Design a binder for these strands. Structure first.
Lengths: 193, 148, 14, 259, 125
RNA sequence: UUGACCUCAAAUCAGGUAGGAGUACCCGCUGAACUUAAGCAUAUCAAUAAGCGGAGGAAAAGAAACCAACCGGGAUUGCCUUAGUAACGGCGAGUGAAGCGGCAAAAGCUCAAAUUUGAAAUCUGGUACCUUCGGUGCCCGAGUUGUAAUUUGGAGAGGGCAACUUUGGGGCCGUUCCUUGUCUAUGUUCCUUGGAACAGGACGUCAUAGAGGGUGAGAAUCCCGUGUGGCGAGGAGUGCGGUUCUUUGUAAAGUGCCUUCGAAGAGUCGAGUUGUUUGGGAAUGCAGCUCUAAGUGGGUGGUAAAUUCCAUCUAAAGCUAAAUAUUGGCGAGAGACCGAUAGCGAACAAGUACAGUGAUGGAAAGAUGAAAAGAACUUUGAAAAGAGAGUGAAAAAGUACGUGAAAUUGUUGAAAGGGAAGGGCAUUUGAUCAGACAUGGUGUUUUGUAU
RNA sequence: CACGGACCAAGGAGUCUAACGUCUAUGCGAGUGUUUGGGUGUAAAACCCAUACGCGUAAUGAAAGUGAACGUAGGUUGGGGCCUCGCAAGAGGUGCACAAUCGACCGAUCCUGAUGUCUUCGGAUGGAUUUGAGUAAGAGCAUAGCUGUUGGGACCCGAAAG
RNA sequence: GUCGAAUUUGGGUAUAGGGGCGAAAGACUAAUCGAACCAUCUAGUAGCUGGUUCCUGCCGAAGUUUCCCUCAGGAUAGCAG
RNA sequence: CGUGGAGGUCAGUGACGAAGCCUAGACCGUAAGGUCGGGUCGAACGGCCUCUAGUGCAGAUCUUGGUGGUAGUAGCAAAUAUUCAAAUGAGAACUUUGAAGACUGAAGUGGGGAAAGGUUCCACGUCAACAGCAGUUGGACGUGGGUUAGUCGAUCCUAAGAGAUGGGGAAGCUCCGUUUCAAAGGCCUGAUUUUAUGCAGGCCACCAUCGAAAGGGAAUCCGGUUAAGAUUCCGGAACCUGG
RNA sequence: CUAUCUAGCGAAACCACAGCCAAGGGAACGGGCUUGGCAGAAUCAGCGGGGAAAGAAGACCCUGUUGAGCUUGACUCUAGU
RNA sequence: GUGGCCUAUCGAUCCUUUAGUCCCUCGGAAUUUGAGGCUAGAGGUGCCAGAAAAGUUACCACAGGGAUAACUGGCUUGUG
């Protein structure tokens, strides 16, 4: 069972796995079906673009916070600031997420400008008459792509003020480590008489 | 495939390369890593030492994202710059136009000092750095500015 | 199917 | 079928009945009763290692290797030593790579399309396909593979305005766009040197599609594969001048039998 | 070749469709071509055959014999003609089952429905 | 005395509804052991099989009492990855998720808790009529122990001020979708073989049709079809595209500022204990008992507890497409699959025949020939059948039928043979058999005058 | 004087998979991997593609955490090949890989504990018969194949049992 | 042997598998009983036996070490390619 | 080396005969195996470069099928027993008739039934298989006919027992229990004379149902009749129930 | 009455190939091998020396890290109480 | 002089416990308990490279063994 020098393997095939083996022969036919469904939905919503406008939004999780990303909806404050309601926006092609909140003016302003560009880029046909032909597109996310904000410039001058920037991190670590002990020593000093 | 297999060559030969005495049987020593403290102990102690026991302290709900700190050594540090401008910034060994290098946006978390950048000034935007790395950068004439 | 009875001998066997 | 061979309730009878210990079918009155069961050596049985659908059917090939191969296959179109080796009947051809006008891309009718190729010189390669229709030999005949035939040329366009449908019915003839260029068409059977009829627009776009020493490829990151040897004729290298300046004289090529 | 997804290129299915065909589809299967005279006179190439038509044999060992149809044996995929028979040893006459594809019509049996079918196929009468 | 209410009943009362089948996939309950650990008791097999209940074309889940600790994200589902990781585990064998990120698909919402109180405004049923998937009127009834309007936490409501903005429903005809019908090219021209030409050769034609099948042998061109387009028929339908009639509405909704308010789910959360379960570790979830809350409260924040803060949701009520699954059913298309001891058990009157008290078990069995033309007739015989004749391309195809192997047997022929036969090296004997014996050559003694 | 075999036909036993090891071939190369998916198509094919993700490029400690040049990226011995002298033999110089060996560097452990300071923080410097699956002008990634390993019915047949 | 009864017997009826019934033999429970039969889990496991399908060419063993509830087996080193 | 299939080529072979099979006929190869000739046969098949695998049998008390020696052998010997003639027939140890001799010996080899079987009953025709020899015969084969009830039985009653309802358990398939902690139903006379059946009275309380072709039980016997039916049909003579 | 012979009918067990001995050696008791003796078609009835005759993967014994039935202050549990 | 003049006198993982550093962690941020870790020992496995473990079967079963008994035979011949 154990034999010559080979790594310890962990193969989880002690159950009845060969009752549950899903080989995706479906892949190509299913891609075809996806494409045809997209085309069908398009034909049903013939002027409309098959996808809503989603916002630009900053990612969680410090691994990814450096990156911006597409989100769910435009944060009722943002649509009010852009000058229309959520119940009307949802009918115009704008996704609204009541449960996210604005904590940053950069993202707020970015999504607001996104909404303005959208409102200028679209035309909304009246409920009455003409149906003024408009040669539909299929991606709002392609028209309004998600743009990574530029953080700085390519070249700058050097501002070296001599505190060495590893000492900095080290002292931050130290004061976070000994915060509570120091507050306790201060309390006990104040306790003196 | 089947026809470059030695099974085709074992045809006619009785035991199929498995022995007349030893007789390929089902599981003549166990199944799996059985016998590790027992009849397979020598294999385990010779080739997989440390397999038995426990060594330290647990971590419940460990996410491999608080530990994201991909490292970059100084020896590279210009691979982050496109080649269209590298020679320019190197021959213009100049302050007041020194290039800024955002390692985080490139996907790095810490800078390390393996070896020998040139003597050009550079601004390095990093989350963390090492002592020797910063020493070498500002010896080349640049600076590190911390970010998050 | 058949279990004939004459092959059964324990005389002189043991 | 996973059920195959196992739709029975068979149990070995054991020892003491003067029969092999294979599982046997119970009951009465049938003929099947008493018969062997469940085993590869047995009739009505289960085959050994029943075929599964989670066999690996398709294969990853690296993209740059696919491209190396398609490029080599294209390059072998410009070599008659390889094109005749496949039996494409190009001995009466003036030159290869054979190129024609872009007016062929706009032909709508098969009669006009085929007359063009007759005039160009593919007449023999078409007639070969007409002459080579034979029944298949295997059991493929009653598995929808009843006929075999050769391939004619591969016509290559840049834009289609009727030529695909013009040649859709002609036996052997295949059509392709320059951007795709199936290797299954360019090196059939893995035998290099298919006879290819390019158009001028295709023959021009081929640089845009694969690149050169001066332009880009239209495939991101793709540089054509570089040679490890400058020329493939090495006798010329050996005999040029400088080696021969350095070389010791030769022997007689069949040693004298001494003793 | 075939481009439709509703059409099958399978020997098994096509042969089964042939042999398990009902009498209404076997009528279409057992069509015969017209002679040159009738093709020029009606503008038609073929037609489904029936019982009082006159016909001429153009393949086989009965090649060259004319005659009127006697019965369309659709179950046998065949046509029986009067004056085309096998004379047995016991002085009997057994009709010979022929295929209409090996036949040529010289004279039609006409009716409102055949005339309509012809006009539908683009004929002139 | 009479008439009501509450509760409980009966009626072949008036109208309806549930059951059973199928069950591949789906929601749940119950619930193993074989097995692995080289023994075995935890563990694993497995939160599986069997068993029970209940659904649909999908189901379930689902609009956060979520994830997080970020510059924060934002219903659910599914795929790549996370990860064979963190963790569990006689820390042994072995088991083992989730957040992040990329993508597919995307859709959001409604009740309870409020006095309409200047008017139960609500609703089933019956009945008459009508333009009938229903509507109008009238009449009983339900219901204040609360039916409609208003609101659902993202908010919102009651007053006060101010302005603006936007609306509904039927027809008709197309389009869409489904089912379905019909029509739309080109040789059956010569010669040979053959029983048959669908083969071979020659000459051609059509090709957006050289896919496939049939036909007396390999058929684009004989037939059905294929390819390309056209002409219809019946339906479903509000999906939108035009036209037309009704004007819905002294109605409804949205929006700004000020003010007073802002109800928000209890034998539930939560705790102890037990049991089970989980990767969940001082206890992940579920259930049982016991205890049992609160309202600047409660829950979560993956090490129990006290103290102090912070962040984040808002349970104990509820609906909702799509992406996802699918050995079943209906309908289609394909295969480097099997090719009648194979492939489904079943290519056939197969879940048949047959066995068994029963549950249950469970086969074998394909091919004459193009066409029965399936052998008229004569004769021997009691007859079966034979010999002849005859059909057929063939009876060396005669329903014991395509081909027709071997074991095994018969006849004929040859050969040998004193308790085996068989085999090897070598030869005799007998039988049988392959190969080289032309070649270039002086040459014309030559006829056919150059052979 | 051990087991199977009366005879013949047909059938009949190291397979496929998930993850891996060594070796080998191919492509690219400090990068590599198109095929979850999107586009596209003569439609399960072929062709094209973004963002991520995986592996590798940094190890080490249980962890907090820290994190690879004194030097021509070291010295010494040997080393193919190359250069110079030589008619050659041989002599010298440079010496990749590779082997051995003494060192330097990174991390852990044990010490030493500077300027300084929230006077309890910080940890410079120099060490050590200690230790690492490390550094020292990167080699890997993907695919394919033989062989081997583990799990799976697992080369075929085979229990008593539960 | 027994033969007017603790008799013999039909039919109906009850008792069903760790259960029944038993004047007790572990006897009977449909030719099945020291735990029936059917199907499924199940191709249950097997360190044990048997078998394991073509030619040629080159090379060519071990039955020994240490450990193992180890002694009919494995890991390990050795022999071989 | 060989096999099944796949891409490619040989514009490969082929109804003027593909593949297959037989061939003490030939040739090649160390061999695996290849090739040719002949005969049979009738429709497809191969060489080379590559791909692929359900790929090569002497064995597994292997599987399925088929066939042998054994061997014209063992053997077709329990139940006392057959014989002669004729007829039929192609043919007679076995069929039919007759004559004779025997047995069962009324606790029968008789005559009837229950269970079970299911048309075996009976006729006609008939002998390929079956009847362990035969066969003109048959429970065989083929074609047909045939079972008549107020009284015989079932049907009805209860037995041991089974089992709904109400209710109670159980996650549940279902279990308990059968008069139970139930509001558990129907019978006579009428009274009216819109009239059909309400009200008038009164009575009554058991509390499903199933369970016996041998228990209990309303009533039929003779004679005759068919190839085959009879307490059933005909004839005659009776009886019971209900109205 | 069989056996026996005949007419008709017509199996099975078993079978590597087969069937003369002595000794020798040899898996230590050979039908075959070595050495010798010997050895003449085809056969019938009987027989029971041999074929280590056939019948069954020894049922005694041992081994198995295979079981079951039964017991008990074994180990661990449990309905009930 | 790093125990006994020398050659023998002894013991893994997991679990518990103790000593040491008074160091790391309890992963939203702190203090104090508690818990977990790192380094070095003890608690013991004598079948001593370390399962947690009573019998019977004259009712028996399976896989196998001539690796292994009970007969003959054969080597031997103590004993007879």
């Amino acid at each position: 069972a154990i034999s010559k020098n080979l790594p310890i393997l962990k193969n989880h095939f002690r159950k009845h796995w060969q009752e549950r083996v899903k080989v995706h022969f479906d892949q190509a036919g299913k891609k075809v079906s996806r494409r045809n469904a997209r085309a069908t939905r398009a034909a049903k919503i013939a002027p409309r673009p098959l996808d809503l406008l989603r916002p630009v939004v900053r990612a969680p999780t410090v691994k990814y916070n450096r990156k911006v990303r597409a989100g769910r909806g435009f944060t009722l404050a943002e649509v009010k600031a852009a000058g229309l309601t959520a119940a009307y926006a949802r009918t115009i092609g704008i996704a609204v997420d009541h449960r996210r909140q604005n904590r940053n003016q950069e993202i707020f302003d970015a999504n607001v400008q996104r909404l303005k560009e959208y409102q200028s880029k679209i035309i909304v046909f009246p409920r009455n008459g003409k149906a003024p032909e408009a040669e539909q597109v299929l991606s709002a996310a392609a028209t309004f792509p998600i743009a990574q904000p530029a953080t700085d410039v390519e070249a700058r001058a050097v501002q070296d003020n001599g505190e060495s920037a590893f000492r900095t991190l080290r002292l931050a670590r130290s004061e976070k480590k000994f915060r509570g002990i120091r507050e306790k020593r201060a309390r006990e000093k104040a306790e003196a008489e | 495939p089947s026809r470059f297999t030695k099974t085709r060559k074992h045809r006619g030969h009785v035991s199929a390369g498995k022995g007349r005495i030893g007789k390929h049987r089902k599981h003549p020593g166990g199944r799996g890593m059985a016998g590790g403290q027992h009849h397979h102990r020598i294999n385990m102690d010779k080739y997989h030492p440390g397999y038995f026991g426990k060594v330290g302290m647990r971590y419940f709900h460990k996410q491999q994202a608080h530990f994201w700190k991909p490292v970059l050594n100084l020896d590279k540090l210009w691979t982050l710059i496109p080649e269209d401008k590298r020679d320019q910034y190197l021959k213009s060994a100049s302050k007041e136009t020194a290039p800024v290098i955002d390692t985080l946006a490139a996907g790095y978390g810490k800078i390390l000092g393996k070896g020998r950048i040139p003597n050009v000034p550079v601004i390095v935007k990093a989350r963390f750095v090492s002592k020797l790395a910063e020493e070498k950068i500002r010896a080349a004439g640049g600076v590190v500015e911390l970010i998050a | 199917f058949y279990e004939d009875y004459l092959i059964f001998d324990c005389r002189a066997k043991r | 079928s996973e059920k195959a061979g196992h739709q029975t309730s068979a149990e070995s009878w054991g020892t003491g009945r003067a029969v092999a210990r294979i599982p046997r079918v119970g009951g009465g009155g049938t003929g099947r009763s008493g018969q062997g069961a469940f085993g590869n050596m047995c009739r009505g049985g289960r085959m050994f290692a029943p075929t599964k659908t989670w066999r690996k059917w398709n294969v990853k090939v690296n993209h740059n290797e696919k491209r190396y191969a398609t490029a080599s296959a294209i390059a072998a179109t410009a070599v008659a030593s390889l094109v005749l080796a496949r039996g494409h009947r190009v001995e009466k051809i003036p030159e290869i790579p054979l190129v024609v006008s872009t007016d062929l891309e706009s032909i709508q009718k098969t009669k006009e399309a085929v007359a063009a190729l007759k005039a160009v010189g593919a007449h023999s390669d078409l007639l070969k396909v007409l002459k080579s229709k034979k029944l298949r030999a295997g059991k493929g005949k009653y598995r929808n593979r009843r006929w075999t035939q050769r391939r004619g040329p591969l016509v290559v366009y840049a834009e289609d305005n009727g030529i695909v449908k013009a040649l859709r019915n002609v036996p052997g003839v295949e059509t392709a766009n320059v951007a795709s260029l199936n290797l299954l068409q360019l090196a059939p059977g893995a035998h290099l040197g298919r006879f290819v009829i390019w158009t001028e627009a295709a023959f021009t776009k081929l640089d845009q599609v694969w690149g050169s020493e001066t332009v880009a490829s239209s495939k991101v990151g793709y540089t054509l594969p570089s040679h490890i040897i400058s020329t493939s004729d090495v006798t010329r290298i050996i005999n040029s001048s400088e080696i021969q300046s350095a070389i010791r004289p030769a022997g007689q090529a069949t040693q004298k039998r001494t003793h | 070749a075939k481009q439709s997804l509703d059409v099958s290129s399978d020997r098994r299915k096509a042969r089964k469709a042939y042999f398990t065909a009902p009498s209404s589809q076997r009528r279409v299967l057992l069509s015969a071509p017209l002679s040159k005279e009738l093709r020029a006179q009606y503008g038609i190439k073929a037609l489904p055959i029936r019982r009082d038509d006159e016909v001429l044999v153009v393949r086989g060992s009965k090649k060259g014999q004319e005659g009127k149809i006697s019965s369309v044996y659709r179950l046998k995929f065949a046509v029986q003609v009067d004056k085309v028979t096998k004379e047995k040893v016991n002085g009997a006459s057994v009709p010979i089952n022929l295929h209409p594809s090996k036949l040529v019509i010289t004279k039609l049996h006409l009716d409102k429905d055949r005339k309509a079918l012809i006009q539908r196929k683009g004929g002139k009468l």
